[PDB]
């Protein structure tokens, strides 16, 4: 990787948030964009706040300019694409340390694991084009041939993995070079581990592995760490239903775009669509929304909360109005 230099630094460095916080459940990412020239500057900033604030990267080695040089070599390889880019993965950081802080869910991990997720937020969807798996695969595209030929179908998630490592292995954006031996280790496993859980065709595998070592702890302690591990970055991944009605939908019109645009390209590409990915076969936002809610959201965090993470019960209940709201734009339509 290039080096960052003292101007771009400089540049995020001057970035003012006074009457934001970065911590607070109600934080809204759209306003801090909206109230500046450069967003992308605003965004860096946000995410350098956080880390800092954390205590995490002092704890374990990490300068204050190794941070922001690391925060700024993963913003370059984020696209300009309508949903999967920096400030997705921004807010993931965000919503994962009010998880832990808020939420509490820092109870049930190690300082180091905590410092680890935070980190894997912003290295988690890097350069994503806005294409799933399921692209690559059925149009044989280039990443495709290689994924089948090489035996693994998480083509995006290992591509995201191969650039998390490019990054850190440059001592001038190496956030972990302070750890020691076998910690230095850890962090590595768990962060490629954590990507490789993002992929939606293991959710239903992870969530089963999760519930399994919840039901004990005792047993396996290591397994319930690395399984909460994973199960935090799933949800901060998912968890834009999780927020105020009016960011929840922002979000939603952003995503929804890029499957629309996915399905453009299979059809030029001579593939048949899906029609949840097909312009001509859908008319409003509501009902997709709460069809995500009703069979993955839902579930997935009443499921989590119940078996140990009682701390996030504010996200099933914000699930439940958000999706209130959309049945009433159905029923008035
Ligand atoms: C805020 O809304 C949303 C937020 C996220 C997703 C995602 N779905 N899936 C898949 C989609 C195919 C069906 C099988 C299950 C989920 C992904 O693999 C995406 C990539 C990684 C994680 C989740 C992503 C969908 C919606 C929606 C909607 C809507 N139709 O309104
Ligand atoms: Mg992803
Ligand atoms: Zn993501």
Redesign the pocket.
């Known amino acids: 990787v290039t080096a960052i230099t003292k101007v771009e630094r400089e540049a995020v460095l001057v970035c003012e948030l006074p009457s934001f916080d970065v911590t607070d459940v109600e934080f809204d990412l759209f306003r801090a964009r909206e109230s500046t020239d450069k967003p992308l500057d605003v965004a860096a900033a946000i995410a350098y706040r956080l880390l800092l604030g954390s205590g995490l990267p002092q704890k374990f080695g990490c300068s204050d300019e190794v941070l922001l040089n690391f925060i700024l070599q993963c913003r370059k390889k984020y696209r300009n694409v309508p949903?999967?880019n920096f400030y997705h993965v921004v807010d993931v950081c965000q919503t994962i340390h009010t998880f832990l802080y808020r939420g509490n869910v820092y109870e049930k991990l190690t300082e180091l694991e905590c410092f680890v997720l935070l980190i894997t937020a912003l290295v988690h969807d890097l350069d994503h084009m806005g294409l799933?798996?399921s692209f690559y695969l059925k149009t044989e595209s280039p990443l495709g041939i290689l994924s089948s030929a090489s035996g693994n179908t998480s083509v995006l998630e290992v591509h995201h993995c191969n650039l998390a490592v490019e990054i850190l292995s440059d001592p001038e954006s190496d956030v972990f070079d302070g750890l020691e031996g076998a910690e230095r280790t850890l962090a590595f496993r768990s962060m490629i581990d954590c990507v490789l859980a993002?992929?939606?065709?293991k959710?239903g595998s992870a969530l089963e592995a999760f519930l399994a070592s919840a039901a004990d702890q005792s047993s396996d302690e290591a397994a319930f760490h690395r399984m909460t591990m994973e199960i935090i970055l799933?949800a901060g991944?998912?968890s834009?239903?999780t927020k105020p009605f009016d960011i929840?939908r922002q979000?939603?019109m952003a995503?929804?775009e890029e499957?629309y645009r996915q399905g453009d390209m299979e059809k030029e590409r001579g593939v048949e669509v899906?029609p949840?990915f097909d312009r001509s076969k859908?008319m409003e936002?509501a009902?997709?929304?709460?069809?995500?809610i009703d069979?993955?959201?839902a579930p997935f965090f009443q499921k989590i909360v119940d078996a140990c993470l009682q701390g996030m019960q504010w996200t099933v209940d914000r699930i439940k109005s958000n999706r209130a709201q959309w049945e009433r734009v159905l029923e008035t339509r």
């Open positions: 949903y999967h799933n798996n993002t992929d939606m065709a959710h799933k991944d998912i834009n239903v929840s979000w939603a995503v929804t499957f899906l949840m859908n936002l009902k997709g929304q709460i069809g995500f069979f993955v959201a």
